[PDB]
Design a protein around this ligand. Sequence first.
Ligand SMILES: CCCC(=O)C(=O)O
Ligand code: NI
Length: 179
Amino acid sequence: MVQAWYMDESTADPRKPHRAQPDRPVSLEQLRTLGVLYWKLDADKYENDPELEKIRKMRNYSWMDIITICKDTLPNYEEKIKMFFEEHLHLDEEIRYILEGSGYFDVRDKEDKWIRISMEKGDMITLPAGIYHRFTLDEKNYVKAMRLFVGEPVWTPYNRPADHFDARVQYMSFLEGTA
Ligand SMILES: CCCC(=O)C(=O)O
Ligand code: NI
């Protein structure tokens, strides 16, 4: 089962787990109240998986590509990695399907406290437009991921503060309505 937790108070070493002490796990159901959705898939089948297709059609994820994040192969690696981990939001969904390796997506909860989501092979996640988030590799320092998008992609991050955007306003409005 996919693991998520509240983070400790250390600001050092973003790639470590940073589990709060004592443990404060976060359920998939609490993530749903933040509009964060999750599916589990057989990642070996990603080239041809009726179960992925079901998700894509339901959600209108009509666009996809594959990205591989490691020091050696990714162009402009160091800079891209810095940008991923800056707290930011987008005007669209962020949908990522992990094909190999692993990573952390951090999201703010309703009190603006960080929740760390551990994503592994087979895990697929969508972060809603307007949510403040960031991504980092974990200590294994490797991830291969499918990126999906509702239509032709725009990747632009807006680093916090980014509160004026309609996507942020609507997302705040969505949060009033959940548990
Ligand atoms: C696999 C996640 C990396 C990424 O595409 C992002 O954080 O924008
Ligand atoms: Ni992002």
